[PDB]
Scaffold this active site. Structure first.
Site, PDB file in Angstrom:
ATOM      1  N   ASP A 280       0.900  -1.190   0.000  1.00 27.05           N
ATOM      2  CA  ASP A 280       0.000   0.000   0.000  1.00 27.05           C
ATOM      3  C   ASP A 280       0.930   1.229   0.000  1.00 27.05           C
ATOM      4  O   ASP A 280       1.687   1.433   0.984  1.00 27.05           O
ATOM      5  CB  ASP A 280      -0.939  -0.002   1.217  1.00 27.05           C
ATOM      6  N   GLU A 298      -3.677   4.123  -2.657  1.00 25.72           N
ATOM      7  CA  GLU A 298      -4.042   3.741  -1.290  1.00 25.72           C
ATOM      8  C   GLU A 298      -5.566   3.814  -1.062  1.00 25.72           C
ATOM      9  O   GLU A 298      -6.187   2.918  -0.412  1.00 25.72           O
ATOM     10  CB  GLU A 298      -3.320   4.619  -0.263  1.00 25.72           C
ATOM     11  N   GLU A 299      -6.187   4.889  -1.540  1.00 24.08           N
ATOM     12  CA  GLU A 299      -7.595   5.138  -1.249  1.00 24.08           C
ATOM     13  C   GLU A 299      -8.455   4.066  -1.914  1.00 24.08           C
ATOM     14  O   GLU A 299      -9.369   3.581  -1.310  1.00 24.08           O
ATOM     15  CB  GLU A 299      -8.022   6.553  -1.658  1.00 24.08           C
ATOM     16  N   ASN A 412       5.261   1.199  -8.585  1.00 25.77           N
ATOM     17  CA  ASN A 412       5.769   2.595  -8.687  1.00 25.77           C
ATOM     18  C   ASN A 412       5.503   3.391  -7.381  1.00 25.77           C
ATOM     19  O   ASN A 412       5.018   4.564  -7.400  1.00 25.77           O
ATOM     20  CB  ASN A 412       5.170   3.272  -9.914  1.00 25.77           C
ATOM     21  N   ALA A 417       1.578  10.627  -7.018  1.00 16.67           N
ATOM     22  CA  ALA A 417       1.276  11.793  -6.247  1.00 16.67           C
ATOM     23  C   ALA A 417       2.497  12.325  -5.500  1.00 16.67           C
ATOM     24  O   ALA A 417       2.593  13.561  -5.326  1.00 16.67           O
ATOM     25  CB  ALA A 417       0.137  11.525  -5.290  1.00 16.67           C
TER      26      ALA A 417
HETATM   27  N1  LIG Z   1      -3.321  -1.043  -8.288  1.00 18.07           N
HETATM   28  C1  LIG Z   1      -2.068  -0.690  -8.680  1.00 18.07           C
HETATM   29  N2  LIG Z   1      -1.175  -1.687  -8.863  1.00 18.07           N
HETATM   30  C2  LIG Z   1       0.102  -1.340  -9.288  1.00 18.07           C
HETATM   31  N3  LIG Z   1       0.430   0.002  -9.486  1.00 18.07           N
HETATM   32  C3  LIG Z   1      -0.500   0.949  -9.326  1.00 18.07           C
HETATM   33  C4  LIG Z   1      -1.746   0.621  -8.925  1.00 18.07           C
HETATM   34  N4  LIG Z   1      -2.409   1.805  -8.806  1.00 18.07           N
HETATM   35  C5  LIG Z   1      -1.612   2.825  -9.150  1.00 18.07           C
HETATM   36  N5  LIG Z   1      -0.406   2.284  -9.465  1.00 18.07           N
HETATM   37  C6  LIG Z   1       0.814   2.949  -9.879  1.00 18.07           C
HETATM   38  O1  LIG Z   1       1.565   3.463  -8.761  1.00 18.07           O
HETATM   39  C7  LIG Z   1       1.838   4.845  -9.002  1.00 18.07           C
HETATM   40  C8  LIG Z   1       1.888   5.571  -7.645  1.00 18.07           C
HETATM   41  O2  LIG Z   1       0.591   5.532  -6.989  1.00 18.07           O
HETATM   42  P1  LIG Z   1       0.248   6.771  -5.991  1.00 18.07           P
HETATM   43  O3  LIG Z   1      -1.032   6.398  -5.317  1.00 18.07           O
HETATM   44  O4  LIG Z   1       0.234   8.026  -6.748  1.00 18.07           O
HETATM   45  O5  LIG Z   1       1.374   6.666  -4.896  1.00 18.07           O
HETATM   46  P2  LIG Z   1       2.378   7.663  -4.206  1.00 18.07           P
HETATM   47  O6  LIG Z   1       3.036   8.533  -5.247  1.00 18.07           O
HETATM   48  O7  LIG Z   1       3.198   6.990  -3.205  1.00 18.07           O
HETATM   49  O8  LIG Z   1       1.387   8.695  -3.427  1.00 18.07           O
HETATM   50  C9  LIG Z   1       1.114   8.462  -2.048  1.00 18.07           C
HETATM   51  C10 LIG Z   1      -0.158   9.277  -1.668  1.00 18.07           C
HETATM   52  C11 LIG Z   1      -0.518   9.049  -0.199  1.00 18.07           C
HETATM   53  C12 LIG Z   1      -1.761   8.262  -0.364  1.00 18.07           C
HETATM   54  O9  LIG Z   1      -2.606   8.390   0.794  1.00 18.07           O
HETATM   55  C13 LIG Z   1      -2.450   8.778  -1.563  1.00 18.07           C
HETATM   56  N6  LIG Z   1      -1.310   8.918  -2.518  1.00 18.07           N
HETATM   57  C14 LIG Z   1       0.731   5.335  -9.906  1.00 18.07           C
HETATM   58  O10 LIG Z   1       1.161   6.530 -10.588  1.00 18.07           O
HETATM   59  C15 LIG Z   1       0.606   4.138 -10.855  1.00 18.07           C
HETATM   60  O11 LIG Z   1       1.702   4.137 -11.859  1.00 18.07           O
END
Ligand SMILES: Nc1ncnc2c1ncn2[C@@H]1O[C@H](COP(=O)(O)OP(=O)(O)OC[C@@H]2C[C@@H](O)CN2)[C@@H](O)[C@H]1O
EC number: 3.2.1.143
Length: 506
Positions: A280, A298-299, A412, A417
């Site tokens: 997550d 995450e959401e 990733n 974000a």
């Molecule tokens: N279900 C998924 N399985 C694999 N990869 C995924 C999946 N959903 C999204 N992704 C990929 O993972 C990347 C990062 O996801 P983000 O949710 O933006 O994660 P991150 O940058 O760590 O942002 C963290 C914040 C804090 C959280 O509460 C909400 N987002 C996305 O841009 C997609 O390329």
């Protein structure tokens, strides 16, 4: 071309088949168990332990709505007021707003219910609205008001630096989440709060505000869950574990070899990660904006497996050296899209097997990356070490040998974000997994070039038998040569080109 590169996914390790047998479930100083272990049987609703409600209203436990110390200045009983407010029949959305505000009077101007009103009046068809106020909402009220017969044991806060587990029933979680929906948890609302300022939001009031087109999709997703768990009581258990490590590797000196990699631009962590440690991509306040406006990785996981949401009741903000591990959450919904295109697609019937503690065989770890606002900031050694140690804490299982650890199902992390560079973060995760003696299954979420780049770098490093320490030293050289004395916003040459040149030159 190919959709996946590296080790065949069939050759990776998976739960509970790679699982140690579990020791007997028992309450101890570092494990709170809220049900009768002696009566735990497959297919039977767990019995609360103790039999009668016991209250603690203090700085180390959840402040329960049903506490005799939950008082309102008129001092009257707030639990009595909640009961009177919620046992009225609802026929129009104003009725539900007015009920929630009877025990939340200080928020009668601050809390907007536009999204709830619009969902009920302007999204649902008549028969759907009728089902909501005649069946779903009254069933939710009844399971919420059963709280002191269901959650009889005080729930300890998983506070900063605690190494502690809570195992509770899915039924106990359903009662707690119905309470969060009706916004009954005391001391969790004030923006100028003290005690719980370091805890995430739990009450669901921000789900009901504003006119985002995704609020009807969040509500459809949560009402799918509530409809299923009020109609047939769920029978399994869920464990929440806060983990805090004191000793991190001296990365520069680590002689461990890299482990195996499967990398693919098709599939997702939640559907293609069965039996694996599923990551997550968290906020340090776990669950992020799940009950407000957030709708990324995450959401979405917290909506489709809503039992994750209750982690926000008792999990203090994660420090650098901490993670949360959740075992046994069930998937209730399927979705399409992502972010602003996210839609609820349908009910999901979870076919996961259960372990010897009646937990679904699904293990999820929340690890929060850093949020970078400038590209070069992430290459600073302090910041690289921070991300390595975070991921290591998430992957490490003290006591357990390598042959009983499943692969990590990741991707990733930090690179949507939170603005991180996927090629660096991929290597950081590869090194952390190597030090934890786990293989890596990496989902690039539709990026076929990134898949080939990660594969090529991993097999280059593996074939040359470079250690964790060898690779980390190359990261420190990239920083020194291309980032530290760099005037411009992006460096002159990229990480992977640098590494290939440094190694091939030597
Ligand atoms: N279900 C998924 N399985 C694999 N990869 C995924 C999946 N959903 C999204 N992704 C990929 O993972 C990347 C990062 O996801 P983000 O949710 O933006 O994660 P991150 O940058 O760590 O942002 C963290 C914040 C804090 C959280 O509460 C909400 N987002 C996305 O841009 C997609 O390329």
């Amino acid at each position: 071309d190919k959709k996946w590169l590296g080790t065949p996914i069939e050759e990776m390790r998976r739960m509970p088949r790679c699982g140690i047998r579990l020791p007997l479930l028992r309450p101890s100083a570092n494990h709170t168990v809220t049900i009768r272990v002696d009566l735990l049987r497959a297919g039977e609703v767990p019995k609360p332990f103790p039999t009668h409600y016991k209250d603690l209203w203090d700085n180390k436990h959840v402040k329960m709505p049903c506490s005799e110390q939950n008082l309102y200045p008129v001092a009257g009983s707030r639990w009595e007021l909640i009961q009177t407010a919620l046992l009225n029949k609802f026929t129009r959305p104003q009725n539900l707003k007015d009920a929630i505000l009877k025990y939340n009077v200080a928020y009668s101007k601050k809390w907007d219910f536009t999204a709830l009103i619009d969902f009920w009046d302007k999204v649902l068809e008549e028969a759907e609205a009728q089902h909501l106020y005649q069946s779903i909402l009254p069933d939710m009220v009844k399971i919420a008001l059963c709280l002191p017969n269901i959650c009889t044991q005080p729930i300890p806060l998983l506070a900063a630096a605690m190494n502690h587990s809570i195992t509770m029933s899915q039924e106990q979680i359903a009662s707690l989440l119905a309470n969060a929906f009706f916004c009954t948890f005391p001391r969790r609302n004030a923006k100028m709060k003290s005690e719980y300022s370091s805890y995430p939001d739990i009450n669901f009031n921000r789900l009901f505000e504003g006119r985002s087109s995704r609020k009807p999709e969040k509500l459809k997703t949560l009402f799918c869950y509530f409809r299923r768990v009020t109609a047939a009581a769920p029978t399994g258990l869920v464990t929440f574990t806060r983990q805090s490590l004191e000793d991190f590797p001296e990365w520069e000196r680590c002689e461990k070899p890299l482990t195996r990699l499967h990398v693919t631009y098709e599939g997702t962590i939640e559907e293609n990660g069965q039996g694996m440690l599923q990551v997550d991509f968290a906020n340090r306040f776990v669950g992020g904006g799940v009950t407000s406006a957030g709708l990324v990785q995450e959401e979405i996981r917290f909506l489709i497996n809503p039992e994750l949401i209750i982690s926000r009741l008792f999990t203090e903000v994660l420090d650098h050296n901490e993670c949360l591990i959740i075992t046994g959450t069930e998937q209730y919904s399927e979705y399409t899209g992502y972010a602003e295109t996210y839609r609820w697609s349908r009910s999901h019937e979870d076919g996961s097997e259960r372990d010897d503690w009646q937990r679904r065989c699904t293990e999820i770890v929340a690890i929060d990356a850093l949020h970078f606002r400038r590209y070069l900031d992430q290459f600073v050694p302090e910041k690289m070490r921070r991300e390595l140690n975070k991921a290591y804490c998430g992957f490490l299982r003290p006591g357990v040998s390598s042959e009983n650890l499943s692969a990590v199902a990741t991707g990733n992390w930090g690179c949507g974000a939170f603005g991180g560079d996927a090629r660096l973060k991929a290597l950081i995760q590869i090194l952390a997994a190597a030090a934890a003696e786990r293989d890596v299954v990496y989902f690039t979420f539709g990026d076929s070039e990134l898949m080939r780049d990660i594969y090529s770098m991993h097999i280059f490093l593996t074939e040359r038998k470079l250690t964790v320490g060898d690779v980390y030293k190359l990261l420190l050289r990239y920083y020194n040569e291309e980032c530290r004395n760099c005037s411009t916003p992006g460096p002159d040459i990229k990480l992977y080109p640098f590494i290939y040149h440094a190694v091939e030159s030597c």
